Design an enzyme around this catalytic site. Structure first.
Site, PDB file in Angstrom:
ATOM      1  N   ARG C  12       0.673  -1.044   0.079  1.00 41.99           N
ATOM      2  CA  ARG C  12      -0.418  -0.242  -0.067  1.00 41.99           C
ATOM      3  C   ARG C  12       0.875   1.331  -0.041  1.00 41.99           C
ATOM      4  O   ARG C  12       0.771   1.874  -0.864  1.00 41.99           O
ATOM      5  CB  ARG C  12      -0.727  -0.396   1.430  1.00 41.99           C
ATOM      6  CG  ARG C  12      -2.136  -1.202   1.299  1.00 41.99           C
ATOM      7  CD  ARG C  12      -3.056  -1.237  -0.138  1.00 41.99           C
ATOM      8  NE  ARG C  12      -3.800   0.455   0.152  1.00 41.99           N
ATOM      9  CZ  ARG C  12      -3.707   0.911  -1.641  1.00 41.99           C
ATOM     10  NH1 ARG C  12      -3.931   0.122  -2.429  1.00 41.99           N
ATOM     11  NH2 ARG C  12      -4.639   1.380  -1.504  1.00 41.99           N
ATOM     12  N   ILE C  13       2.173   1.421   0.833  1.00 41.95           N
ATOM     13  CA  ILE C  13       2.577   2.177   1.229  1.00 41.95           C
ATOM     14  C   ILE C  13       3.896   2.451  -0.187  1.00 41.95           C
ATOM     15  O   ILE C  13       3.613   3.675  -1.198  1.00 41.95           O
ATOM     16  CB  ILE C  13       3.560   2.329   1.941  1.00 41.95           C
ATOM     17  CG1 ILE C  13       2.683   2.917   3.279  1.00 41.95           C
ATOM     18  CG2 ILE C  13       4.384   3.795   2.126  1.00 41.95           C
ATOM     19  CD1 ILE C  13       1.710   3.908   3.709  1.00 41.95           C
ATOM     20  N   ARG C  82      12.661 -12.062  -1.581  1.00 38.53           N
ATOM     21  CA  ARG C  82      12.585 -11.863  -0.219  1.00 38.53           C
ATOM     22  C   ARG C  82      14.194 -11.623   0.313  1.00 38.53           C
ATOM     23  O   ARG C  82      13.390 -10.682   1.469  1.00 38.53           O
ATOM     24  CB  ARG C  82      11.848 -13.453   0.486  1.00 38.53           C
ATOM     25  CG  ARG C  82      10.885 -13.389  -0.532  1.00 38.53           C
ATOM     26  CD  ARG C  82       9.901 -15.024   0.099  1.00 38.53           C
ATOM     27  NE  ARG C  82       8.032 -14.647   0.397  1.00 38.53           N
ATOM     28  CZ  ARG C  82       7.883 -13.491   1.707  1.00 38.53           C
ATOM     29  NH1 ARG C  82       8.385 -13.143   2.075  1.00 38.53           N
ATOM     30  NH2 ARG C  82       7.324 -13.567   1.247  1.00 38.53           N
ATOM     31  N   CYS C 155       3.042   6.959  10.013  1.00 40.58           N
ATOM     32  CA  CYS C 155       1.709   7.524   9.790  1.00 40.58           C
ATOM     33  C   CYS C 155       1.094   9.018  10.886  1.00 40.58           C
ATOM     34  O   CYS C 155       0.959  10.106  11.091  1.00 40.58           O
ATOM     35  CB  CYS C 155       0.606   7.063   9.536  1.00 40.58           C
ATOM     36  SG  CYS C 155      -0.028   5.739  10.332  1.00 40.58           S
ATOM     37  N   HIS C 182      -7.744   4.629  14.140  1.00 39.80           N
ATOM     38  CA  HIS C 182      -7.302   4.349  12.658  1.00 39.80           C
ATOM     39  C   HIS C 182      -7.817   3.556  11.880  1.00 39.80           C
ATOM     40  O   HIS C 182      -8.048   2.127  12.697  1.00 39.80           O
ATOM     41  CB  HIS C 182      -5.884   4.055  13.277  1.00 39.80           C
ATOM     42  CG  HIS C 182      -5.045   3.940  12.275  1.00 39.80           C
ATOM     43  ND1 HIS C 182      -5.115   3.130  10.609  1.00 39.80           N
ATOM     44  CD2 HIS C 182      -3.762   4.891  12.325  1.00 39.80           C
ATOM     45  CE1 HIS C 182      -3.872   3.734  10.523  1.00 39.80           C
ATOM     46  NE2 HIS C 182      -3.227   4.199  10.950  1.00 39.80           N
ATOM     47  N   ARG C 200      -5.470  -7.358  16.977  1.00 42.03           N
ATOM     48  CA  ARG C 200      -4.892  -7.899  15.279  1.00 42.03           C
ATOM     49  C   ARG C 200      -5.432  -9.352  14.671  1.00 42.03           C
ATOM     50  O   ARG C 200      -5.954  -9.256  13.286  1.00 42.03           O
ATOM     51  CB  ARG C 200      -3.407  -7.559  15.313  1.00 42.03           C
ATOM     52  CG  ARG C 200      -3.943  -5.986  15.496  1.00 42.03           C
ATOM     53  CD  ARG C 200      -2.045  -5.533  14.527  1.00 42.03           C
ATOM     54  NE  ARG C 200      -1.258  -4.415  15.708  1.00 42.03           N
ATOM     55  CZ  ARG C 200      -1.147  -3.222  15.036  1.00 42.03           C
ATOM     56  NH1 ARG C 200      -0.845  -2.902  14.014  1.00 42.03           N
ATOM     57  NH2 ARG C 200      -0.285  -2.636  16.320  1.00 42.03           N
ATOM     58  N   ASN C 318      -3.232   8.440   6.326  1.00 43.22           N
ATOM     59  CA  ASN C 318      -3.267   7.359   6.335  1.00 43.22           C
ATOM     60  C   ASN C 318      -1.748   6.177   5.151  1.00 43.22           C
ATOM     61  O   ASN C 318      -0.423   6.527   5.675  1.00 43.22           O
ATOM     62  CB  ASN C 318      -2.703   6.235   7.839  1.00 43.22           C
ATOM     63  CG  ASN C 318      -4.157   5.476   7.533  1.00 43.22           C
ATOM     64  OD1 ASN C 318      -3.498   4.445   6.696  1.00 43.22           O
ATOM     65  ND2 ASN C 318      -4.765   6.086   7.432  1.00 43.22           N
TER      66      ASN C 318
END
Ligand code: NAD
Ligand code: NAD
Ligand code: NAD
Ligand code: NAD
Lengths: 338, 338, 338, 338
Positions: C12-13, C82, C155, C182, C200, C318
């Site tokens: 995503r970033i 990796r 973020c 968030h 999580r 974010n």
């Protein structure tokens, strides 16, 4: 010169219709001069500019005072009266009312605008009773300029009809079943609450909610040869916009999936250009937000069995794509005004 | 014998209250004999039994006809009139009205049930004006049997007050800020639509929606020493039920996190038993559905800086927990029906 | 000439960063020449162009073959390994690696890019151990051109730090508590499944999920006077993007809300221009998508008690806002490439 | 005496299967004695007890230490090895492995349990290659006790097959199209991320996601006369559990909706009792959580056109209803053990 339009009901479809017009304003025969809604102009200007689905309106400044909403210098007069008989349509010289409240879909309901002074009404929903129904790209050239009240049908009908029309002409549709997997709408409840329909009473963002739809029977009004041959249902699901139609037809002329796809693709390039889009891409509902077509055929999902059982799948942006069609129907009426 | 109770407004709180009462019905001094709501008994019986949040009601059979809802043989009379002055409270011998419409929270509004014949009204929301406000486990023993109209405060206030009361008595709260991260409610819109509050107008299941809350100031009415010392906000988020309070207090007596946790745990075992539950588990909102406590202190999240700045976090089931407290307040009023 | 940049981790970033760079590409000292990611170039080109959050990339054509992604004629080499020790950084002449996998945030982890040949690494997350941490607009001018591994913090820290810095300089922050409400992230689970953090582990789109955050302590590394004075928590909620910080500070200089708001507004127009945006509008999370600021102060929500307890609330995108700051930090490092 | 069972993969289906067994434990021929999973026993006991979908397990205490999960005194041994060849199946005397990882669905994959010492494997998914497939209430009495590896098919197949079997016998199915509107599963991504399927890569809680399904072709393996006559698709939508099948059949014997319904209802009372439930109620997906049937026919949605085009709609709880079937298939294998 311009056809003067008022919007009655500044809801999701009312405000999408206004944004469609503000972006196509330079080549239009319509001028939006008034809005009636149950809220005030400051609330409505705020919601017009700040939209959870369409984002922040960028092209022009949108402001409000007690009397008016201003969208890039254009001043749109506002009033707030639940009863359309009292509306100032004569005083504002309104020609056409875009009836988007959801509550005045019969001839007697919609006529109250005529008696307040408007010359025509375009209902952004299926009509109840004997109201002529048009779907752009299917039957809108049959418009009769002497009609005072019309219907632009529903979002699902605008997705389904063009596809049915292309399949019927190429293969001969004998019978047809539809299911739309449809985004929730303002007609449903946020949390479980009273409603005429015991399924739509139920928390819309937490449930898959079946409901009836007239879309499949309404196709029979715009394609009169198919009257009584189609039926279907809706499943409301927890997305806020964008919907999908799954249509299974029993056809006369035996065929296969590649030919069904080829016929739709050819129509999307020619007779249904701008109405049906043919997509070969592996996309999901988010990707179709803001799409201008009534129906986006998902070509990978087409399948045929035994020659005669055909399934096709098409996307639609139920707010925005539908509002583009309302605007096209209105422009068509403006160009054929009597 | 029994205090005869009518529910006005058979919404989320009305129907949660009714389920609370149906499960504690053997130990009760109350008898629910009537419901007024804007919908009919068949719709309301369906919604009572089929709940997206609580599931299918299992304990007893729930049925309806034109006149009544039947919940395990018990017949609950139904009427449907928006104006409480017209309600048949004298004719049904109603003692206590549970005012759960959200629309009659001032004295003048709630008094219309008295003038229709009820002897007392318990408002399931903060009162506007001068209405005595009770939070069970904080000040309900100050209840005065001659009061005709009372408030059970809000869900947030029932969560926050008991914790504040324990922290104030142990450490001396000088000032305090609250944020509740709160499940969306029926007050919000499903898709962007008109509302008095321009933030609540926005699609509730797609957005974090800040809003004002009187919960923190209302703590000053139930703990009068703290009047004017607390303030806070709400953030509505896309879960249908279960909420969380975050409270930051400036305290007089220097402390550390372990001690703040120990004081609350002790109170949860003694003076606040059944009102505050102390949890050392790492749970999420779903796990607090149906929980009977007004506040569940999430002990791992407690933190202190510089001796005097204390943060605690507490969960509450805003529908069910709150309705348990409305029921307790009502049982308390029944027990002291002088 | 150009600093040659490789992105490690095209998540995503990584993909937000790439879009940020493609839109500011004309003014840039950076050239993105390579990507390492666990997936292939065709998948990654598809995900770059079709984004559920940002929509369809419009500015340029995006295409792929076995070796490369092409974004408007610019060819970005791709590899898939990796282990960063094996990466072709010397062979591609890579100067700067944007470390966006989430998995190489210690010095030992991030140093593997140096040993593969890169000259510097910018970690898109807090560093573990002794890694210099920069927040643009707070301490980025302390950057030392001889540092080989840096962190752009989180973020949340980019949202919180600038506001803290302005409030500290005006009022003197003695202690402070933070809660960020968030959006869920890729680190969480879609449905309950195993995870190092038991909270999580839980279905992210169905729950409010508290978690720990180092954002508040990390403010002490970028504003060294406040080390050990701040703490906080996170609540993950069911929105996919856009977050909000709530900050409660105990300050030395007595004040009121209007003054706290005026100090931040002044800073947003001068020293923090482009970093803090001051908003007086009543908006919700959806309206902050794509916003370029690190913090957007929601001025109506500001409140003060007893002179010294101050609460402010600030929004941040974010994904996108943070990626704009990674890009700024990288441009800053490019400009001082000694 | 007991068949000793191990669960490989303690995921949604593994843990639902374990809860199904713990509630039917008193009349069972199976004893669950081991679990292998990629996480540790404390994590797994936590997730077993605290479930976002099923709620808190109530019937017995669930605890863990380094070695074991304890569910009401029953000690279940735990190990954690990704490669089933290394598992201690001989040392634990395991007869039957419930293969629920999703990753060992071919004969070569699933056989590794046999070579570690298990006697049989039941795969909780469609098999790849030549693995016998059973659907309880359709073909499970054809079980051959000498088979060492079997498949219980998918959730969609277990919903569809029984309905197809009843319709085929009454009307003669010539061709059939299916669409399942299906809750998201752990196979999809929370936010846009790499995946073998470019549609399942996309944020699952924000999108309607089409995908392929083998359910309609797999019906041809359990009802061999229909091999090659069915096809269909899936639309993943943003609910976490409960799914719905929409099936359109071209049948030989002309019929109407009331007769189709009557045939299903009669089967649900007799030959398909406990497998198909016939519902005349107006319910939504939340209401079917925890339902024990493979398929719940929504009788109001049935429709027929022109005699031969039949549409039916059925609900299923894809986690829980499927796990009940896995347990029934296992009990059946235990009762026919060689
Ligand atoms: N996907 C869609 O949203 C969609 C697509 C096609 C057609 N439609 C149809 O368009 C119509 C509007 O639907 P919508 O989604 O905008 O609903 P909505 O509730 O968002 O919009 C209705 C608006 O009218 C206002 N209103 C209600 N009664 C009124 C009255 N008596 N006078 C003036 N204003 C009044 C409401 O406050 C609201 O602003 C309905 O007929 C709906 O069936 C909806
Ligand atoms: N989390 C919560 O849901 C929560 C918690 C605590 C307190 N409250 C408060 O409880 C009250 C109700 O909340 P809710 O969430 O149940 O709302 P809701 O909208 O579900 O319930 C209101 C009910 O009353 C009906 N109603 C409205 N006007 C009426 C009238 N004039 N006469 C008769 N019936 C009428 C509605 O049709 C509905 O059935 C509000 O005061 C609210 O602030 C809600
Ligand atoms: N809101 C946010 O999303 C946000 C904000 C600020 C910082 N961050 C941080 O940025 C980092 C990435 O976050 P994200 O949200 O993009 O996560 P993500 O899972 O979307 O991105 C990680 C990407 O790197 C890939 N990857 C994982 N291991 C790899 C390896 N060994 N080699 C190469 N590629 C690998 C993944 O496949 C994926 O494409 C994390 O450090 C996170 O804390 C995230
Ligand atoms: N609706 C449903 O969830 C549903 C219904 C029917 C069938 N299925 C099938 O059941 C199977 C499991 O699906 P699920 O929803 O439980 O997924 P999941 O990811 O929740 O469960 C898989 C479990 O196996 C673990 N695992 C992965 N690889 C492993 C390995 N090599 N060794 C040991 N453990 C390993 C994972 O950590 C997880 O605990 C899949 O084959 C799926 O297709 C799912």
């Amino acid at each position: 010169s311009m056809v003067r339009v008022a919007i009655n009901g500044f809801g999701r479809i009312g405000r999408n219709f206004m944004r469609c017009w503000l972006q196509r304003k330079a080549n239009s025969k319509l001028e939006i001069v008034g809005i009636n809604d149950t809220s005030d102009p400051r609330t409505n200007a705020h919601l017009l500019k700040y939209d959870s689905m369409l984002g922040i309106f960028q092209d022009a400044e949108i402001t409000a005072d007690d009397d008016c909403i201003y969208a890039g210098g254009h001043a749109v007069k506002c009033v707030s009266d639940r009863n359309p008989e009292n509306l100032p349509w004569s005083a504002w010289g309104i020609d056409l009312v875009i009836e988007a409240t959801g509550v005045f879909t019969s001839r007697e309901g919609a006529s109250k605008h005529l008696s307040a002074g408007a010359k025509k009404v375009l209902i952004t929903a299926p009509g109840k009773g004997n109201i002529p129904t048009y779907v752009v790209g299917v039957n809108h050239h049959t418009y009769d300029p002497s009609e005072d009240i019309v219907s632009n049908a529903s979002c699902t009908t605008n997705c389904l009809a063009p596809i049915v029309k292309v399949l019927h002409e190429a293969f001969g549709i004998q019978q047809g079943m539809m299911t739309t997997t449809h985004s929730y709408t303002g007609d449903q409840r946020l949390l479980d609450a009273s409603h005429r329909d015991l399924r739509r009473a139920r928390a819309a963002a937490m449930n898959i909610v079946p409901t009836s739809t007239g879309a499949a029977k309404a196709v029979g009004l715009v394609i009169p040869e198919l009257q009584g041959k189609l039926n279907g249902i809706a499943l409301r699901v927890p997305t806020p916009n964008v919907s999908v139609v799954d249509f299974v037809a029993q056809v006369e002329k035996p065929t296969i999936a590649e030919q069904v796809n080829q016929v739709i693709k050819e129509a999307s390039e020619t007779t249904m250009k701008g109405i049906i889009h043919y997509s070969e891409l592996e996309l999901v509902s988010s990707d179709y937000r803001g799409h201008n077509a009534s129906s986006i055929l998902d070509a990978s999902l087409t399948m045929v069995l035994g020659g005669n059982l055909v399934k096709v799948v098409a996307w639609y942006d139920n707010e925005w794509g539908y509002s583009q069609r309302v605007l096209d129907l209105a422009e068509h009426m403006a160009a054929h005004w009597a």
